[PDB]
Amino acid sequence: QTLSLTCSVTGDSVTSGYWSWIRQFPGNKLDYMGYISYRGSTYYNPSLKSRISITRDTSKNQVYLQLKSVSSEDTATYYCSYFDSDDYAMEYWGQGTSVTVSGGSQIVLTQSPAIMSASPGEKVTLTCSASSSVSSSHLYWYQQKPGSSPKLWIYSTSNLASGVPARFSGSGSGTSYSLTISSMEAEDAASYFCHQWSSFPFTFGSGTKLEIKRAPHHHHHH
Amino acid sequence: QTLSLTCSVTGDSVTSGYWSWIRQFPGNKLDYMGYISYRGSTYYNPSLKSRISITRDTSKNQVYLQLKSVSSEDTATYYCSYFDSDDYAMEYWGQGTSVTVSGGSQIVLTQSPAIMSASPGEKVTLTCSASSSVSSSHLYWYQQKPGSSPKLWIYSTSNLASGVPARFSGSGSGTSYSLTISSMEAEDAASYFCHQWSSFPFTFGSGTKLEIKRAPHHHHHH
Amino acid sequence: QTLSLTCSVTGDSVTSGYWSWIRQFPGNKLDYMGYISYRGSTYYNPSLKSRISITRDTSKNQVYLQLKSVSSEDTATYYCSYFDSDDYAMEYWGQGTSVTVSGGSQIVLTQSPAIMSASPGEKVTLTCSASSSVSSSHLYWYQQKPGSSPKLWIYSTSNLASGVPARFSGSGSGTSYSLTISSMEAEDAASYFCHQWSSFPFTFGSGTKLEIKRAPHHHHHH
Ligand code: NI
Numbered sequence: 325q326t327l328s329l330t331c332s333v334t335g336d337s338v339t340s341g342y343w344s345w346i347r348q349f350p351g352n353k354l355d356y357m358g359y360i361s362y363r364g365s366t367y368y369n370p371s372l373k374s375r376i377s378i379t380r381d382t383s384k385n386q387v388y389l390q391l392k393s394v395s396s397e398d399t400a401t402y403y404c405s406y407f408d409s410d411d412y413a414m415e416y417w418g419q420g421t422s423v424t425v426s427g428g429s430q431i432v433l434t435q436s437p438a439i440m441s442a443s444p445g446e447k448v449t450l451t452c453s454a455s456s457s458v459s460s461s462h463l464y465w466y467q468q469k470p471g472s473s474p475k476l477w478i479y480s481t482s483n484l485a486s487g488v489p490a491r492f493s494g495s496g497s498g499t500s501y502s503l504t505i506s507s508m509e510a511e512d513a514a515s516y517f518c519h520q521w522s523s524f525p526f527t528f529g530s531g532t533k534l535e536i537k538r539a540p541h542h543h544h545h546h
Numbered sequence: 547q548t549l550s551l552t553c554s555v556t557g558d559s560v561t562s563g564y565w566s567w568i569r570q571f572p573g574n575k576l577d578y579m580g581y582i583s584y585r586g587s588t589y590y591n592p593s594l595k596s597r598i599s600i601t602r603d604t605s606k607n608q609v610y611l612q613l614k615s616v617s618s619e620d621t622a623t624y625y626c627s628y629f630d631s632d633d634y635a636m637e638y639w640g641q642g643t644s645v646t647v648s649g650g651s652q653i654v655l656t657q658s659p660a661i662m663s664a665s666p667g668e669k670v671t672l673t674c675s676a677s678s679s680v681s682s683s684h685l686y687w688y689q690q691k692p693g694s695s696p697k698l699w700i701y702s703t704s705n706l707a708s709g710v711p712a713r714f715s716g717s718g719s720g721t722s723y724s725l726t727i728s729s730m731e732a733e734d735a736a737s738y739f740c741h742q743w744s745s746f747p748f749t750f751g752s753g754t755k756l757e758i759k760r761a762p763h764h765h766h767h768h
Numbered sequence: 769q770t771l772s773l774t775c776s777v778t779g780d781s782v783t784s785g786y787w788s789w790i791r792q793f794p795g796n797k798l799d800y801m802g803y804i805s806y807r808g809s810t811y812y813n814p815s816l817k818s819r820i821s822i823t824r825d826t827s828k829n830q831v832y833l834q835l836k837s838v839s840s841e842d843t844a845t846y847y848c849s850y851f852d853s854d855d856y857a858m859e860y861w862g863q864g865t866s867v868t869v870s871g872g873s874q875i876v877l878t879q880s881p882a883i884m885s886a887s888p889g890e891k892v893t894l895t896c897s898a899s900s901s902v903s904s905s906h907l908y909w910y911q912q913k914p915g916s917s918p919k920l921w922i923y924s925t926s927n928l929a930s931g932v933p934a935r936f937s938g939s940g941s942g943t944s945y946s947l948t949i950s951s952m953e954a955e956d957a958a959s960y961f962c963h964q965w966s967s968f969p970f971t972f973g974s975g976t977k978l979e980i981k982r983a984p985h986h987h988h989h990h
Contacts, residue, residue: 325634328560396708422694423636471692
């Protein structure tokens, strides 16, 4: 029983780049499966390799993911991301197709805490601990709102994607990195995953779910 | 005026299976349109048949839905689900394309209540009443969070999709089935639809919207 | 460095219509890029024209968006909408593919306020001010819930898409238009954008984010 999914984020055009498949398990732990480059070369995450096969068909203009010998373990939502660059670097993510099946070492990134509780205007600080050293220009932060696919929020440790509101910043180097918000705003109620792609295989943090309380209220009418 | 939508969840590969179109009306009442099998055979829901036409093109690797003679009544969001099995059973849903048009018997599943209000840690119990007897291994439960497409939560009455947190269980047989949560968790704030596919045509419940209160608070500072 | 995206909302079938690309910037300001018609003719928004190129391939059954000379400014989420009509008028939107890049006159519609705070059952009233006169049958209202793509809520100023709950209405003419809800309902917690397509180039309002308070509570146990 094989899993076969299609991807088609990019159009015609396109002269290079890297299509990568990524799955998110329930629990939200993100997993980097592998990629296929324009000139045909692929990379599969060792955790599989024997099972996974990424391919493409410029004839149909579709990129495929074949995950042989599936089992309830592969139940997750699958994303297909496209990545290109010179100095300018483009990154777009597909929608996530949710898959459910029935039959019942690297740089590990440690997100903490698993769920930060914040009221509005409050200063917020999230930490990501890398099980080893990671190039500071290959450390990324993604924001994900329930139902949406990951949005590149901060790239190269401290650089804010265009449009990220000023209240955000990104600190770090070597094994300890962090993201902070000068002061909540409820539009920041999401999940933040740190990402590292300097060491193969590429990894993601477990997640911090960020959500704000309501703020105080009183009843001295009174 | 015809409605023409495409689907492409599966990739190359694939040696069988059943692509099925399903629409969700505003109100969230889900509707099972029909399916097309790999070896070419189709099934259309009687409510239409004269209007609907499902087809595929392995050349473009796309599955199509043609719904002739549309009218404001067909305004809904359309999903394309793929279903395969031996003993292992794969099921993945497309994204939902939202359609809006302007011009102004079976086993009916009864969800109840239409909207359960729960605080955290509370025991929760949702009921689904079938207008007739339904095979207990063809009764399914789907969870849908606003904006997302249905996620297979429980299959065969009481079996939890991999990753469904332990606090969930599924009771039932014959005409009365139910789903319960040992104790809320706000991540359970979604909609739960029961599904039956033992009797043609296949049907879905109306929906229960599940959402939690906040929990108590006090002000004895004091 | 060019941006190349694909679209495939429509299926085979289809005898005309207009595929249009629209981007939404972080901040949510919506932007109308252009369209391509079935018989091949295109229209590009003047803000670009030199950069944008819309095309299609009936061979692959895909519609493309090529946005040459990208820069962090084009970071947004891109939608592909399909529009057809005789008297019956079909409109469906794609999913939004989120794009992020790194390198650091018309009828302007003014949404107000940028964020209305409402408790349940309350009468709500949102206003849209057009920098000039707009045909009242080319003024539209879209609802967007975080993570979802715009849903056509009201068309031709005052006509409710099928399924829009009765509590909604749409007032206006000439330069001032408005949308109202007879009484909240928390399922109305979304964003509402007014849209005008009588004058080229077509425009969208900035957005009003609509969200309800909780309602009062007391503690006289007591
Ligand atoms: Ni109180």
